[PDB]
Design an enzyme around this catalytic site. Sequence first.
Site, PDB file in Angstrom:
ATOM      1  N   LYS A  30       0.849  -1.218   0.000  1.00  0.00           N
ATOM      2  CA  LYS A  30       0.000   0.000   0.000  1.00  0.00           C
ATOM      3  C   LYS A  30       0.872   1.251   0.000  1.00  0.00           C
ATOM      4  O   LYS A  30       0.671   2.109  -0.844  1.00  0.00           O
ATOM      5  CB  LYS A  30      -0.972  -0.072   1.175  1.00  0.00           C
ATOM      6  CG  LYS A  30      -2.252   0.825   1.151  1.00  0.00           C
ATOM      7  CD  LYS A  30      -2.861   0.955   2.537  1.00  0.00           C
ATOM      8  CE  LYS A  30      -3.366  -0.355   3.105  1.00  0.00           C
ATOM      9  NZ  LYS A  30      -2.363  -1.382   3.427  1.00  0.00           N
ATOM     10  N   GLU A  86       0.936   5.201  10.527  1.00  0.00           N
ATOM     11  CA  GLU A  86       2.209   4.603  10.082  1.00  0.00           C
ATOM     12  C   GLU A  86       3.606   5.078  10.617  1.00  0.00           C
ATOM     13  O   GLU A  86       3.769   6.119  11.252  1.00  0.00           O
ATOM     14  CB  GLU A  86       2.203   4.613   8.548  1.00  0.00           C
ATOM     15  CG  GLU A  86       1.964   3.188   7.966  1.00  0.00           C
ATOM     16  CD  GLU A  86       0.641   2.604   8.375  1.00  0.00           C
ATOM     17  OE1 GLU A  86      -0.336   3.353   8.441  1.00  0.00           O
ATOM     18  OE2 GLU A  86       0.570   1.366   8.614  1.00  0.00           O
ATOM     19  N   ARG A  87       4.632   4.248  10.368  1.00  0.00           N
ATOM     20  CA  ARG A  87       6.019   4.448  10.798  1.00  0.00           C
ATOM     21  C   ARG A  87       6.595   5.860  10.711  1.00  0.00           C
ATOM     22  O   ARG A  87       6.251   6.658   9.833  1.00  0.00           O
ATOM     23  CB  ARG A  87       6.977   3.538  10.014  1.00  0.00           C
ATOM     24  CG  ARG A  87       6.735   2.053  10.170  1.00  0.00           C
ATOM     25  CD  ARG A  87       5.844   1.530   9.045  1.00  0.00           C
ATOM     26  NE  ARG A  87       5.771   0.063   9.049  1.00  0.00           N
ATOM     27  CZ  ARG A  87       5.120  -0.671   8.138  1.00  0.00           C
ATOM     28  NH1 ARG A  87       4.455  -0.109   7.165  1.00  0.00           N
ATOM     29  NH2 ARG A  87       5.163  -1.989   8.234  1.00  0.00           N
TER      30      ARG A  87
HETATM   31  N1  LIG Z   1       6.248  -3.118  -6.084  1.00  0.00           N
HETATM   32  C1  LIG Z   1       6.647  -4.080  -5.303  1.00  0.00           C
HETATM   33  N2  LIG Z   1       7.380  -5.158  -5.826  1.00  0.00           N
HETATM   34  C2  LIG Z   1       7.814  -6.251  -5.061  1.00  0.00           C
HETATM   35  N3  LIG Z   1       7.591  -6.375  -3.731  1.00  0.00           N
HETATM   36  C3  LIG Z   1       6.856  -5.347  -3.176  1.00  0.00           C
HETATM   37  C4  LIG Z   1       6.373  -4.185  -3.860  1.00  0.00           C
HETATM   38  N4  LIG Z   1       5.674  -3.335  -2.988  1.00  0.00           N
HETATM   39  C5  LIG Z   1       5.744  -4.001  -1.786  1.00  0.00           C
HETATM   40  N5  LIG Z   1       6.415  -5.231  -1.859  1.00  0.00           N
HETATM   41  C6  LIG Z   1       6.617  -6.284  -0.738  1.00  0.00           C
HETATM   42  O1  LIG Z   1       5.608  -6.234   0.302  1.00  0.00           O
HETATM   43  C7  LIG Z   1       6.128  -5.715   1.577  1.00  0.00           C
HETATM   44  C8  LIG Z   1       5.039  -4.745   2.098  1.00  0.00           C
HETATM   45  O2  LIG Z   1       4.739  -3.629   1.207  1.00  0.00           O
HETATM   46  P1  LIG Z   1       4.512  -2.127   1.626  1.00  0.00           P
HETATM   47  O3  LIG Z   1       4.367  -1.446   0.327  1.00  0.00           O
HETATM   48  O4  LIG Z   1       5.621  -1.563   2.489  1.00  0.00           O
HETATM   49  O5  LIG Z   1       3.083  -2.049   2.270  1.00  0.00           O
HETATM   50  P2  LIG Z   1       2.546  -1.175   3.481  1.00  0.00           P
HETATM   51  O6  LIG Z   1       3.682  -0.194   3.833  1.00  0.00           O
HETATM   52  O7  LIG Z   1       1.401  -0.475   2.927  1.00  0.00           O
HETATM   53  O8  LIG Z   1       2.257  -2.175   4.487  1.00  0.00           O
HETATM   54  C9  LIG Z   1       7.529  -5.158   1.208  1.00  0.00           C
HETATM   55  O9  LIG Z   1       8.377  -5.335   2.365  1.00  0.00           O
HETATM   56  C10 LIG Z   1       7.972  -6.009  -0.041  1.00  0.00           C
HETATM   57  O10 LIG Z   1       8.539  -7.304   0.268  1.00  0.00           O
HETATM   58  O1  VO4 Z   2      -1.231  -1.989   5.790  1.00  0.00           O
HETATM   59  V1  VO4 Z   2       0.132  -1.434   6.496  1.00  0.00           V
HETATM   60  O2  VO4 Z   2       0.286   0.034   7.274  1.00  0.00           O
HETATM   61  O3  VO4 Z   2       1.595  -2.194   6.595  1.00  0.00           O
HETATM   62  O4  VO4 Z   2      -0.334  -2.282   8.567  1.00  0.00           O
HETATM   63 MG   LIG Z   3       2.218   1.235   5.426  1.00  0.00          MG
END
Ligand SMILES: Nc1ncnc2c1ncn2[C@@H]1O[C@H](COP(=O)(O)OP(=O)(O)O)[C@@H](O)[C@H]1O
Ligand code: VO4
Ligand SMILES: [Mg+2]
Lengths: 471, 471, 480
Positions: free
Chosen positions: B162, B188-189
Amino acid sequence: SAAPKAGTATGQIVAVIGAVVDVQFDEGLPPILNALEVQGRESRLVLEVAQHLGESTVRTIAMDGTEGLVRGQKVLDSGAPIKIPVGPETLGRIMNVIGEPIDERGPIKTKQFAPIHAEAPEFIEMSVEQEILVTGIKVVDLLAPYAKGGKIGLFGGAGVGKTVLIMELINNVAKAHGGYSVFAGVGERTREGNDLYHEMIESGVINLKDATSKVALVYGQMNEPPGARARVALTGLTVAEYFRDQEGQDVLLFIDNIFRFTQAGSEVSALLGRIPSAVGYQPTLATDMGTMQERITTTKKGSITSVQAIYVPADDLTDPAPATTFAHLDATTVLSRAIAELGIYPAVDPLDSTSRIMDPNIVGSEHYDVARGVQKILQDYKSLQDIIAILGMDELSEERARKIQRFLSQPFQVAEVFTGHMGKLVPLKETIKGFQQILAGDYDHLPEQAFYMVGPIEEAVAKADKLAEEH
Amino acid sequence: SAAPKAGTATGQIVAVIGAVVDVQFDEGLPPILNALEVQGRESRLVLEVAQHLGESTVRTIAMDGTEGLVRGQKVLDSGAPIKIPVGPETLGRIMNVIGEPIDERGPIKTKQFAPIHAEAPEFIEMSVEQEILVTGIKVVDLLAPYAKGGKIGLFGGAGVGKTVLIMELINNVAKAHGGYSVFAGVGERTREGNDLYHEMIESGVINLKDATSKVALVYGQMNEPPGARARVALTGLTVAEYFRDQEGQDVLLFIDNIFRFTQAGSEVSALLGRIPSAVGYQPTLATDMGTMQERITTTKKGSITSVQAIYVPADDLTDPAPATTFAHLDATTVLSRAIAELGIYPAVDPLDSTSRIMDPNIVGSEHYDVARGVQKILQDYKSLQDIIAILGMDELSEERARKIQRFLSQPFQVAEVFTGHMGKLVPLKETIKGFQQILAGDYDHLPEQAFYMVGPIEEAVAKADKLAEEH
Amino acid sequence: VDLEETGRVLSIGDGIARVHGLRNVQAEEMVEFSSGLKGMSLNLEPDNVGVVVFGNDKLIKEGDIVKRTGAIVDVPVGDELLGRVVDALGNAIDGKGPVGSKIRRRVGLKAPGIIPRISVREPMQTGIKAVDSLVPIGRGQRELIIGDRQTGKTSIAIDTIINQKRFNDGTDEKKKLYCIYVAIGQKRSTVAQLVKRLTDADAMKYTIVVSATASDAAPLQYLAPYSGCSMGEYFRDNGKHALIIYDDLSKQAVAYRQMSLLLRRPPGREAYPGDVFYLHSRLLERAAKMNDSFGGGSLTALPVIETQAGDVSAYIPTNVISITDGQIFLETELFYKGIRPAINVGLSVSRVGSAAQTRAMKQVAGTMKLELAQYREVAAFAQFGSDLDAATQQLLSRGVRLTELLKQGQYSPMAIEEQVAVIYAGVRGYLDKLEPSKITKFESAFLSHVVSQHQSLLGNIRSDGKISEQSDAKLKEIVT
Ligand SMILES: Nc1ncnc2c1ncn2[C@@H]1O[C@H](COP(=O)(O)OP(=O)(O)O)[C@@H](O)[C@H]1O
Ligand code: VO4
Ligand SMILES: [Mg+2]
Ligand SMILES: Nc1ncnc2c1ncn2[C@@H]1O[C@H](COP(=O)(O)OP(=O)(O)OP(=O)(O)O)[C@@H](O)[C@H]1O
Ligand SMILES: Nc1ncnc2c1ncn2[C@@H]1O[C@H](COP(=O)(O)OP(=O)(O)O)[C@@H](O)[C@H]1O
Ligand SMILES: [Mg+2]
Ligand SMILES: [Mg+2]
């Protein structure tokens, strides 16, 4: 010592609602956990104080029926928790949740009694020494090993082989045991307590004559209130304690279901003025299971090799009951209900049966490897049995288990009352050669269920004769 | 204006319980939503009024820690809601949930400040004009199109892609954007907020020297109380507002999780004197998510092309959290957790990724048809993948998809920190010829995963060479 | 005598003292009872305060006088505490005497922020091959180690901590690491199992361990982590670095609801007091990275979590994974398979990205974890191939053989340059083809063979700090 202030240690009951009696003292409020004596009685009714409501009124938990109690009855303050007589002079006898004699053999003459609420052993009391102890059982002894002072935990989903097993551990272990033993029956049937009594007579363990008795029986079961099932586990523990400490010996303790210590709260919580939780339960189950189990341990003065039992409400391990408990038991054995269909007995499962004593240093490099290898084959086995092949085996990929599953299905002693099968056991002795073969391939081919309700590889060919296949 | 009555606008704190401080004024009750100043402080503690309890006592929600607060402390009545300084003089700086400067660069000199609670734009203010805006992303730009003033919504089940996506939309869109931008980080962080800061320096976006800054950073996160995560989203919105209206420009707004605006209530509701609801939640979540999101819109004075993010508690879209939200986002993208296994990234799913801007008039007749056709093949695909054939493909019925699934798996820019794969993008340009082929059959045959972690059809044969198969 | 600065208990039970008086008590200042016991004021109300008592009730009773300790819940900290074990309120218990410290530290601190922090760099070595290589942990970050019962969470963390050995007595001070082990819930014997065991490897000599073991009333099992956080914050605020392990925040979850329900704070999800987030956000958010301009210090935290049969997305886990950057999942489902640590890729990440993994792993490990990200399909197919892309078998030959190199396991860590030794050999497919089985003896012997003759190759990572064009060949010669 048990002696109140220079002001009335007598209160008058102001409220009764099933298992909760509220009492009101004017000149000497009794602490939480104090055992209270109800006057005007035709028996012995003790109400354990639980809260200090204010308005100079306490809140007790009834230790027996609250029948006929009346709003005004005098309640006496003992001035100390429920204390039971502890000593060798309790061996061979049967006590109840207060120390009253229930085996009918008269007064329990003892030097002293100990409070059932005692401070758990401190950090600088614990002991890292984990010396092994053999049971000669398949999964139970080999797979998830046991140990001295170690806690055993049998997770049964209501009639899956939790209590049968315990009588059994009594068989191989209790009898041959040097040092004293205890059996707290918490919650469960009175039928069993009886038999267990007389069986302990038939086999001398409890002798009504000499003074050659080693077990001590503390009971508080089903036909009683929760205040009672709440503490019978404590009492039968306060017993084992006194023996380990003040009498330096390695005791054994058998709790038939130790989480009844929690059905208890689940039956007194809300009715105490508390807000429910997981399933309704209690905002205390953690500390509850905690504060209690952290007594049944070893120390710089003696050891308590215990064996408990923990029930699985609605067959859900997802219950914070069997669950929360896990973190205490020094070997797991989650007997499965979907396993009893399969007849596999004990119903110990090739997954959820852990141990904090299964390293090559104490169990074996050879042993702990094929254990990894037995559950390994078993894991992809759990998948294959349905996944890929879809039930029906054969398919392809010849790349043992069904064999090993029959291996650890030792029907043993306590299961004789079903089909004459007897004491299938023996302490490791000939596991060697046998189980290893299965896994590497050796000796593995005997027409499937042809090796079912037995264990030793020696009976593959000593049965092939029984059921032969050729021409 | 912020000026109370000719009677004390000071109350004295009468109750503190975590995030809820009850206050009692005698000569001048402060309306609901008013920002209150706690005296006796070593910092700035504002308590937002929430209810008028009677007995001349209000009920506030703490904007920061309630540590050390004391039953009697004076609380001041500002006489107006939490108002943050709005203006161009906030660009390039970082504000917190009150407008306090947290990027440490000193006072935020501004002409005025706007209340964080403002009446949402009326019906006769709205605008039907839906002019398109390209992102050059597979599913995200093509499948579920986006638009000017349109709301984006990324539904992630906790670590599914996300926030990564949002930094990315910053990449292609934010930088190249003419007009100002905002980023409210809610919940978030702090780690990310930091990096995001310095990355915005590394790439000039935020320049600490000249005055060439376009983004404005409003933060209020995790290490803070819910009263704060409740309103940081508001503030970073009160910002974007001022720019669109009083300064007629088409802004962009980036909310890193906008439903934290609701974790908030879920952490203050019950403790406010309310009866729980769905999951425990709040009898206000609807109006909550509502009243808030109905500000981040366009109007007869300017446009706000926004990008939000909405979390999926316990991976359940069945949560009235991701759920209720849907009705607001002008394009859906429910990234799936069962998709990240498959590596498919972004995890946008070929089902739940809608749009109210996907008609042939604006997206394309050709484009919206093969989109219907891509999800069509995909639907019976979702069934066939298991149904009928039972996992293993081959079977019968040769009557592409696995291909297209790799097409829309553009690994792009913000995912470089994993395997060197870079900025896979480009604005529609050569989607033509390419994706259409797959579906009608043309060019479709290249040895399956041979076309996996890339998009353009031109790399089917520009990889066939990489991994060749013949003789 | 004055209810201004003191107060008589109105009620008590289940450790929620509804104290009267205490007009001047602050909102959180821990207080004192007549039986000489602490408890802090949590619910300041119009006619009472509702204090939460540290330790069992018994002695606390209707009328017991309460006194003020005008100081928000603070705990001891300093260097002295190094090499000891205490409860979770400061006081020692390892019977090793007192540690009269003179530098307290409150536990209700607010995490730093955008500006104090910088960037996770200067990784921290677990010593666990599979861990670091695959999942590298950078310093100043929060790595979540979820995993069901019996799965390795405490061992891995115990190895990760044992790994700082050679560091805590050598040269580069900055290349060190102090350790704070928090025990929440656990049997106080399991804790003595570690204290003694860590003492065997001398590891305890540079570690601080805190215990909130079952007996301890719920508030302690609560206040404990916030007590360890502060321990390390001493370093993260004094240039020095640290490693804190919050063994079972999950059990702290089981233990938090208790306390709140008894104050009559309306429950929400699974009793969890709503601020079950602010419970674990507030905490983790405190282990951050420190910028030169602020100190350069660090604090890395690995929160332990209990996986319920395999679910990682349960309320609390979401609550925790939704925060932490990088989560190592440990599956009981595998383990015995030999697949230990047993890490599931696709449901576990490093998040912070390749910044943690030094150029070394950025050279070798660059393929390892995502080769297996989609391989979870093919390794989930091959079991039935036959007629497909004949040679697709390579991407497959590369999971099995390597997997047996990917299974670190022992009470011993293989330093970074040894980890640069054995695995590299695989990523650069040379051992390859050969049927696995014996691979275990390579990883074992390659070292007894390396520390016996190849004492220079490891030296090119303490010189160049990456793989040499040279030693590529050298290694490539002992492997072939
Ligand atoms: N475009 C992408 N391609 C490959 N892996 C991804 C991508 N976006 C996220 N990920 C994987 O999913 C994990 C969580 O995604 P993240 O975008 O940080 O979501 P959120 O911060 O919203 O929880 C990352 O640590 C990575 O391993
Ligand atoms: O959907 V995320 O903010 O990683 O909990
Ligand atoms: Mg997030
Ligand atoms: N590398 C290893 N390979 C195989 N077994 C190991 C290894 N390291 C430790 N073990 C054993 O594995 C188990 C490690 O996990 P451990 O039980 O300590 O923690 P946990 O499962 O995460 O939590 P808990 O203590 O509540 O079970 C221990 O029982 C230990 O003896
Ligand atoms: N070792 C065993 N072998 C075969 N059947 C068993 C064995 N132990 C228990 N069972 C079966 O399961 C039922 C329930 O077991 P039991 O041990 O009495 O469990 P619990 O008393 O803990 O509920 C028995 O009535 C019997 O049919
Ligand atoms: Mg039974
Ligand atoms: Mg553990």
